[PDB]
Amino acid sequence: LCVHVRSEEWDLMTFDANPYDSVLKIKEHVRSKTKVPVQDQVLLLGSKILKPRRSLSSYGIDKEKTIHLTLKVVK
């Protein structure tokens, strides 16, 4: 599908996942990313900081639908 991001975004985002896992996104922000300053891409969702690009399934939909979330960029 495709996913949309609020703020000043310079490229759009898309709802897709590569044939590994989804833990690679949260672990990528820790593996040389939490230890070094410079976030390059930060994500936010319900007053908290998100580490992947999408990880909610809170709505319970199983149909092809787009989504709109908030994202920002620093350094």
Side-chain angles (χ1 to χ4, degrees):
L1 312 177
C2 55
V3 315
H4 301 300
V5 280
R6 290 269 235 181
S7 210
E8 287 202 283
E9 57 114 294
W10 304 331
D11 192 17
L12 56 128
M13 283 215 158
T14 189
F15 173 47
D16 238 325
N18 268 343
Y20 181 85
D21 217 318
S22 62
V23 292
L24 193 62
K25 252 301 116 74
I26 174 174
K27 189 103 287 264
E28 264 265 80
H29 193 263
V30 198
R31 271 181 179 172
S32 222
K33 272 66 147 84
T34 285
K35 271 156 191 258
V36 121
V38 170
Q39 313 302 319
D40 207 298
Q41 238 192 9
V42 293
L43 210 161
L44 274 89
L45 201 151
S47 239
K48 83 95 118 280
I49 182 96
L50 232 61
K51 216 140 272 209
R53 290 173 77 176
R54 212 310 208 79
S55 61
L56 326 174
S57 206
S58 339
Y59 196 130
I61 45 126
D62 195 52
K63 296 189 266 181
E64 48 120 323
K65 245 204 260 271
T66 58
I67 20 169
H68 199 171
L69 329 101
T70 73
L71 192 148
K72 196 168 268 186
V73 317
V74 298
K75 290 278 141 171

Short mmCIF file of all heavy atoms in Angstrom, two decimals, residues 25-72:
data_model
loop_
_atom_site.label_atom_id
_atom_site.label_comp_id
_atom_site.label_asym_id
_atom_site.label_seq_id
_atom_site.Cartn_x
_atom_site.Cartn_y
_atom_site.Cartn_z
N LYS A 25 13.93 -2.87 11.79
CA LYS A 25 13.69 -1.42 11.83
C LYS A 25 13.96 -0.85 13.23
O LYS A 25 14.61 0.18 13.33
CB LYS A 25 12.24 -1.12 11.43
CG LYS A 25 12.07 -0.48 10.04
CD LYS A 25 12.83 0.86 9.90
CE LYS A 25 13.95 0.79 8.86
NZ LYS A 25 13.41 0.78 7.48
N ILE A 26 13.49 -1.50 14.29
CA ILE A 26 13.67 -1.01 15.67
C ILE A 26 15.15 -1.24 16.06
O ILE A 26 15.76 -0.35 16.64
CB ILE A 26 12.68 -1.65 16.69
CG1 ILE A 26 13.03 -1.20 18.13
CG2 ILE A 26 12.58 -3.18 16.58
CD1 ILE A 26 12.04 -1.65 19.21
N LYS A 27 15.74 -2.36 15.62
CA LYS A 27 17.13 -2.75 15.88
C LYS A 27 18.11 -1.91 15.06
O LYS A 27 19.21 -1.66 15.54
CB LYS A 27 17.25 -4.25 15.57
CG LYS A 27 18.58 -4.93 15.98
CD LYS A 27 18.46 -5.76 17.26
CE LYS A 27 18.33 -4.93 18.55
NZ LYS A 27 19.64 -4.75 19.22
N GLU A 28 17.71 -1.37 13.90
CA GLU A 28 18.54 -0.49 13.04
C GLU A 28 18.72 0.86 13.73
O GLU A 28 19.82 1.40 13.70
CB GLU A 28 17.88 -0.24 11.67
CG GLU A 28 18.40 -1.18 10.58
CD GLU A 28 19.55 -0.51 9.80
OE1 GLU A 28 20.69 -0.52 10.32
OE2 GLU A 28 19.25 0.07 8.73
N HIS A 29 17.76 1.33 14.51
CA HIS A 29 17.84 2.59 15.26
C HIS A 29 18.76 2.43 16.48
O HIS A 29 19.19 3.41 17.07
CB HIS A 29 16.44 3.07 15.68
CG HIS A 29 16.37 4.49 16.18
ND1 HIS A 29 16.38 4.88 17.53
CD2 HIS A 29 16.22 5.59 15.40
CE1 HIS A 29 16.36 6.23 17.50
NE2 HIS A 29 16.23 6.68 16.25
N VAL A 30 19.09 1.20 16.90
CA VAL A 30 19.97 0.88 18.05
C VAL A 30 21.38 0.46 17.58
O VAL A 30 22.37 0.74 18.27
CB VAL A 30 19.36 -0.09 19.05
CG1 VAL A 30 20.10 -0.05 20.39
CG2 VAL A 30 17.89 0.23 19.36
N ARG A 31 21.53 -0.13 16.39
CA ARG A 31 22.79 -0.76 15.94
C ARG A 31 23.55 0.35 15.22
O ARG A 31 23.32 0.70 14.07
CB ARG A 31 22.50 -1.86 14.89
CG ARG A 31 22.24 -3.26 15.44
CD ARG A 31 21.99 -4.24 14.28
NE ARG A 31 21.76 -5.62 14.75
CZ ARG A 31 21.38 -6.65 14.00
NH1 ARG A 31 21.15 -6.52 12.72
NH2 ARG A 31 21.19 -7.82 14.54
N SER A 32 24.45 0.96 15.99
CA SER A 32 25.24 2.15 15.62
C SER A 32 24.44 3.45 15.40
O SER A 32 25.03 4.46 15.03
CB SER A 32 26.18 1.80 14.45
OG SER A 32 27.45 2.36 14.65
N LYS A 33 23.12 3.48 15.70
CA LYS A 33 22.21 4.64 15.53
C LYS A 33 21.84 5.32 16.86
O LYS A 33 21.71 6.53 16.90
CB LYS A 33 20.96 4.28 14.73
CG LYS A 33 20.99 4.37 13.20
CD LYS A 33 21.93 3.36 12.51
CE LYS A 33 21.41 2.90 11.14
NZ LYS A 33 21.76 3.82 10.04
N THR A 34 21.71 4.56 17.95
CA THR A 34 21.41 5.11 19.31
C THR A 34 22.74 5.57 19.94
O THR A 34 22.74 6.47 20.77
CB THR A 34 20.69 4.10 20.23
OG1 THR A 34 19.34 3.96 19.87
CG2 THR A 34 20.64 4.48 21.71
N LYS A 35 23.86 4.96 19.53
CA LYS A 35 25.21 5.21 20.06
C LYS A 35 25.80 6.48 19.44
O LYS A 35 26.48 7.22 20.15
CB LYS A 35 26.11 4.01 19.71
CG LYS A 35 26.04 2.95 20.80
CD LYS A 35 26.39 1.55 20.29
CE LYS A 35 26.05 0.51 21.38
NZ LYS A 35 27.24 0.04 22.12
N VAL A 36 25.47 6.80 18.19
CA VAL A 36 25.97 7.99 17.48
C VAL A 36 24.81 9.02 17.48
O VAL A 36 23.65 8.63 17.49
CB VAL A 36 26.45 7.56 16.07
CG1 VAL A 36 25.79 8.22 14.85
CG2 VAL A 36 27.97 7.76 15.93
N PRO A 37 25.10 10.34 17.60
CA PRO A 37 24.10 11.41 17.45
C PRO A 37 23.66 11.50 16.00
O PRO A 37 24.18 10.75 15.18
CB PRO A 37 24.81 12.69 17.89
CG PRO A 37 26.24 12.41 17.42
CD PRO A 37 26.43 10.93 17.72
N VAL A 38 22.50 12.04 15.66
CA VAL A 38 22.18 12.38 14.26
C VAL A 38 21.05 11.43 13.98
O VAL A 38 21.36 10.26 13.76
CB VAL A 38 23.28 12.60 13.19
CG1 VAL A 38 22.66 12.70 11.79
CG2 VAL A 38 24.12 13.86 13.50
N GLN A 39 19.78 11.79 13.91
CA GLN A 39 18.76 10.74 13.77
C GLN A 39 18.46 10.52 12.28
O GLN A 39 18.04 9.42 11.92
CB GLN A 39 17.47 11.14 14.52
CG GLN A 39 17.64 11.67 15.95
CD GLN A 39 18.34 10.73 16.92
OE1 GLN A 39 18.13 9.53 16.93
NE2 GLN A 39 19.11 11.26 17.84
N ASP A 40 18.60 11.57 11.45
CA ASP A 40 18.35 11.69 10.01
C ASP A 40 16.87 11.55 9.62
O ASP A 40 16.30 12.33 8.85
CB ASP A 40 19.29 10.74 9.23
CG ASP A 40 19.59 11.22 7.81
OD1 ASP A 40 18.64 11.32 7.01
OD2 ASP A 40 20.80 11.38 7.50
N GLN A 41 16.12 10.71 10.35
CA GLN A 41 14.71 10.45 10.13
C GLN A 41 14.14 9.97 11.48
O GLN A 41 14.44 8.88 11.96
CB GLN A 41 14.52 9.38 9.01
CG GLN A 41 13.66 9.90 7.85
CD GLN A 41 13.18 8.85 6.84
OE1 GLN A 41 13.30 7.64 6.99
NE2 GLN A 41 12.50 9.28 5.78
N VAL A 42 13.20 10.73 12.02
CA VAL A 42 12.57 10.46 13.32
C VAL A 42 11.07 10.37 13.02
O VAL A 42 10.53 11.11 12.20
CB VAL A 42 12.75 11.57 14.40
CG1 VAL A 42 14.20 11.72 14.86
CG2 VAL A 42 12.25 12.99 14.04
N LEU A 43 10.33 9.61 13.80
CA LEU A 43 8.93 9.33 13.52
C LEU A 43 8.25 9.47 14.88
O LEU A 43 8.83 9.17 15.93
CB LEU A 43 8.71 7.91 12.91
CG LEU A 43 7.50 7.77 11.94
CD1 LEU A 43 7.61 6.53 11.05
CD2 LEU A 43 6.13 7.63 12.61
N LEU A 44 6.99 9.84 14.88
CA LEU A 44 6.26 10.21 16.09
C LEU A 44 4.81 9.81 15.83
O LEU A 44 4.29 9.87 14.71
CB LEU A 44 6.27 11.73 16.42
CG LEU A 44 7.45 12.26 17.23
CD1 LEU A 44 8.62 12.72 16.37
CD2 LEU A 44 7.03 13.48 18.09
N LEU A 45 4.13 9.36 16.89
CA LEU A 45 2.81 8.75 16.72
C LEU A 45 2.15 8.51 18.07
O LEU A 45 2.46 7.60 18.82
CB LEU A 45 2.92 7.39 15.95
CG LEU A 45 1.56 7.04 15.33
CD1 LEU A 45 1.79 6.21 14.08
CD2 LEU A 45 0.65 6.24 16.27
N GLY A 46 1.20 9.41 18.36
CA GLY A 46 0.48 9.43 19.63
C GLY A 46 1.36 9.93 20.77
O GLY A 46 1.52 9.26 21.79
N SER A 47 1.96 11.11 20.57
CA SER A 47 2.88 11.76 21.54
C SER A 47 4.16 10.99 21.93
O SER A 47 4.84 11.35 22.88
CB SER A 47 2.09 12.28 22.74
OG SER A 47 2.28 13.67 22.87
N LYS A 48 4.55 9.96 21.17
CA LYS A 48 5.70 9.08 21.48
C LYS A 48 6.59 8.98 20.23
O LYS A 48 6.14 9.32 19.14
CB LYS A 48 5.17 7.69 21.94
CG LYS A 48 4.80 6.69 20.82
CD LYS A 48 5.90 5.70 20.42
CE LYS A 48 5.54 4.23 20.67
NZ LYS A 48 5.73 3.86 22.10
N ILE A 49 7.76 8.35 20.32
CA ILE A 49 8.73 8.31 19.22
C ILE A 49 8.66 6.88 18.68
O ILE A 49 8.83 5.89 19.41
CB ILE A 49 10.18 8.68 19.67
CG1 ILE A 49 11.20 8.68 18.50
CG2 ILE A 49 10.77 7.83 20.81
CD1 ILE A 49 11.43 10.06 17.88
N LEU A 50 8.48 6.76 17.37
CA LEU A 50 8.40 5.48 16.69
C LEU A 50 9.77 5.33 16.03
O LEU A 50 10.43 6.28 15.61
CB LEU A 50 7.30 5.42 15.58
CG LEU A 50 6.30 4.24 15.68
CD1 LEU A 50 5.53 4.26 16.98
CD2 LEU A 50 5.32 4.25 14.51
N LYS A 51 10.15 4.07 15.92
CA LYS A 51 11.50 3.59 15.62
C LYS A 51 11.42 2.92 14.21
O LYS A 51 12.26 3.24 13.38
CB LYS A 51 11.97 2.61 16.73
CG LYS A 51 13.47 2.73 17.04
CD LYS A 51 13.84 2.64 18.53
CE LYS A 51 13.77 4.02 19.21
NZ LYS A 51 14.73 4.10 20.34
N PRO A 52 10.42 2.08 13.90
CA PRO A 52 10.11 1.70 12.52
C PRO A 52 9.41 2.80 11.72
O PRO A 52 9.11 3.87 12.24
CB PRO A 52 9.23 0.45 12.66
CG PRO A 52 8.46 0.72 13.92
CD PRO A 52 9.48 1.41 14.81
N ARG A 53 8.93 2.44 10.51
CA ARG A 53 8.22 3.34 9.58
C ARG A 53 6.70 3.15 9.76
O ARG A 53 5.94 4.06 9.50
CB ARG A 53 8.59 3.02 8.11
CG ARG A 53 10.04 3.40 7.76
CD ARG A 53 10.49 2.96 6.36
NE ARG A 53 9.98 3.81 5.27
CZ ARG A 53 10.27 3.71 3.98
NH1 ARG A 53 10.96 2.69 3.51
NH2 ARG A 53 9.88 4.61 3.14
N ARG A 54 6.28 2.00 10.32
CA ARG A 54 4.88 1.66 10.63
C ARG A 54 4.82 0.39 11.50
O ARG A 54 5.45 -0.59 11.14
CB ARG A 54 4.15 1.41 9.28
CG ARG A 54 2.67 1.77 9.22
CD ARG A 54 1.87 1.18 10.40
NE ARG A 54 0.45 0.93 10.07
CZ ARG A 54 -0.01 -0.10 9.39
NH1 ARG A 54 0.78 -1.02 8.91
NH2 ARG A 54 -1.30 -0.24 9.18
N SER A 55 4.06 0.38 12.60
CA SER A 55 3.98 -0.75 13.56
C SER A 55 2.80 -0.71 14.55
O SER A 55 3.00 -0.69 15.76
CB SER A 55 5.30 -1.04 14.26
OG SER A 55 5.75 0.06 15.03
N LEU A 56 1.56 -0.48 14.08
CA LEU A 56 0.39 -0.21 14.94
C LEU A 56 -0.57 -1.39 15.03
O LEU A 56 -0.73 -1.95 16.10
CB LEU A 56 -0.39 1.04 14.52
CG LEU A 56 0.47 2.16 13.93
CD1 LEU A 56 -0.42 3.28 13.41
CD2 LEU A 56 1.53 2.69 14.89
N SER A 57 -0.99 -1.96 13.90
CA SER A 57 -2.24 -2.75 13.72
C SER A 57 -3.41 -2.61 14.75
O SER A 57 -4.24 -3.48 14.90
CB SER A 57 -1.67 -4.19 13.74
OG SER A 57 -2.47 -5.10 13.05
N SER A 58 -3.43 -1.51 15.51
CA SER A 58 -4.50 -1.07 16.43
C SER A 58 -5.91 -0.89 15.89
O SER A 58 -6.85 -0.90 16.67
CB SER A 58 -4.10 0.20 17.20
OG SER A 58 -2.70 0.40 17.23
N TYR A 59 -6.12 -0.77 14.56
CA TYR A 59 -7.42 -0.37 14.00
C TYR A 59 -8.17 -1.68 13.70
O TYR A 59 -9.36 -1.78 13.95
CB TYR A 59 -7.19 0.39 12.67
CG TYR A 59 -8.36 1.22 12.11
CD1 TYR A 59 -8.14 2.56 11.71
CD2 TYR A 59 -9.64 0.66 11.93
CE1 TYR A 59 -9.21 3.34 11.19
CE2 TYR A 59 -10.70 1.43 11.41
CZ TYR A 59 -10.49 2.77 11.05
OH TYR A 59 -11.51 3.50 10.53
N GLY A 60 -7.46 -2.71 13.25
CA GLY A 60 -8.06 -4.01 12.98
C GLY A 60 -8.69 -4.07 11.59
O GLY A 60 -9.68 -4.78 11.38
N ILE A 61 -7.99 -3.57 10.58
CA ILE A 61 -8.50 -3.53 9.21
C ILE A 61 -7.59 -4.51 8.46
O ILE A 61 -6.40 -4.65 8.74
CB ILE A 61 -8.33 -2.15 8.49
CG1 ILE A 61 -6.94 -1.45 8.65
CG2 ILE A 61 -9.45 -1.18 8.86
CD1 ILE A 61 -6.29 -1.07 7.31
N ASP A 62 -8.17 -5.10 7.41
CA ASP A 62 -7.61 -6.25 6.68
C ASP A 62 -7.98 -6.02 5.20
O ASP A 62 -8.17 -6.92 4.39
CB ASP A 62 -8.19 -7.61 7.16
CG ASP A 62 -7.34 -8.80 6.66
OD1 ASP A 62 -6.11 -8.75 6.88
OD2 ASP A 62 -7.93 -9.76 6.11
N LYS A 63 -7.90 -4.76 4.80
CA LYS A 63 -8.29 -4.26 3.48
C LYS A 63 -7.24 -3.24 3.07
O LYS A 63 -6.56 -2.63 3.91
CB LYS A 63 -9.68 -3.56 3.48
CG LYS A 63 -10.85 -4.50 3.82
CD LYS A 63 -12.25 -3.87 3.61
CE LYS A 63 -12.79 -3.23 4.90
NZ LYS A 63 -14.15 -2.66 4.69
N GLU A 64 -7.27 -2.85 1.81
CA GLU A 64 -6.18 -2.09 1.23
C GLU A 64 -6.68 -0.65 1.40
O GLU A 64 -7.74 -0.21 0.94
CB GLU A 64 -5.98 -2.44 -0.28
CG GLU A 64 -7.22 -2.48 -1.20
CD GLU A 64 -7.20 -1.50 -2.39
OE1 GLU A 64 -6.69 -0.36 -2.20
OE2 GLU A 64 -7.70 -1.88 -3.47
N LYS A 65 -5.93 0.07 2.24
CA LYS A 65 -6.29 1.39 2.75
C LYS A 65 -5.01 2.10 3.14
O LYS A 65 -4.08 1.52 3.72
CB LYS A 65 -7.22 1.34 4.02
CG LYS A 65 -8.61 1.96 3.73
CD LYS A 65 -9.36 2.49 4.98
CE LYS A 65 -10.43 1.54 5.51
NZ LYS A 65 -11.74 1.80 4.85
N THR A 66 -5.06 3.41 3.04
CA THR A 66 -3.88 4.24 3.19
C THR A 66 -4.02 4.80 4.60
O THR A 66 -5.01 4.60 5.31
CB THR A 66 -3.90 5.46 2.20
OG1 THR A 66 -5.06 6.25 2.39
CG2 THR A 66 -3.92 5.06 0.73
N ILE A 67 -3.00 5.50 5.08
CA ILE A 67 -2.82 5.81 6.49
C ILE A 67 -1.95 7.04 6.51
O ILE A 67 -1.10 7.24 5.63
CB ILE A 67 -2.07 4.71 7.34
CG1 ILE A 67 -1.20 3.70 6.54
CG2 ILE A 67 -3.06 3.99 8.27
CD1 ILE A 67 -0.29 2.82 7.41
N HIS A 68 -2.05 7.80 7.58
CA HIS A 68 -1.51 9.15 7.63
C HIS A 68 -1.06 9.27 9.08
O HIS A 68 -1.84 9.14 10.02
CB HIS A 68 -2.55 10.26 7.28
CG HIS A 68 -1.97 11.60 6.88
ND1 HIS A 68 -2.73 12.66 6.36
CD2 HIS A 68 -0.66 11.95 6.80
CE1 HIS A 68 -1.85 13.58 5.94
NE2 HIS A 68 -0.59 13.18 6.19
N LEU A 69 0.20 9.60 9.23
CA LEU A 69 0.96 9.47 10.47
C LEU A 69 1.88 10.70 10.48
O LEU A 69 1.92 11.48 9.51
CB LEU A 69 1.84 8.16 10.55
CG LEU A 69 1.43 6.85 9.84
CD1 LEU A 69 2.20 6.64 8.53
CD2 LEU A 69 1.73 5.59 10.68
N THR A 70 2.73 10.88 11.49
CA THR A 70 3.47 12.14 11.62
C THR A 70 4.92 11.69 11.70
O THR A 70 5.27 10.61 12.20
CB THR A 70 3.14 13.04 12.85
OG1 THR A 70 3.62 12.57 14.07
CG2 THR A 70 1.66 13.36 13.09
N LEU A 71 5.80 12.48 11.11
CA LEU A 71 7.18 12.12 10.86
C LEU A 71 7.89 13.47 10.74
O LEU A 71 7.31 14.46 10.33
CB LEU A 71 7.36 11.26 9.56
CG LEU A 71 8.76 10.60 9.40
CD1 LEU A 71 8.73 9.25 8.67
CD2 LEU A 71 9.75 11.46 8.61
N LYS A 72 9.16 13.51 11.10
CA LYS A 72 9.96 14.74 11.10
C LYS A 72 11.41 14.31 10.80
O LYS A 72 11.72 13.12 10.76
CB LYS A 72 9.81 15.47 12.48
CG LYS A 72 10.28 16.93 12.44
CD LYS A 72 9.88 17.75 13.69
CE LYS A 72 8.54 18.47 13.48
NZ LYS A 72 8.23 19.38 14.61
#
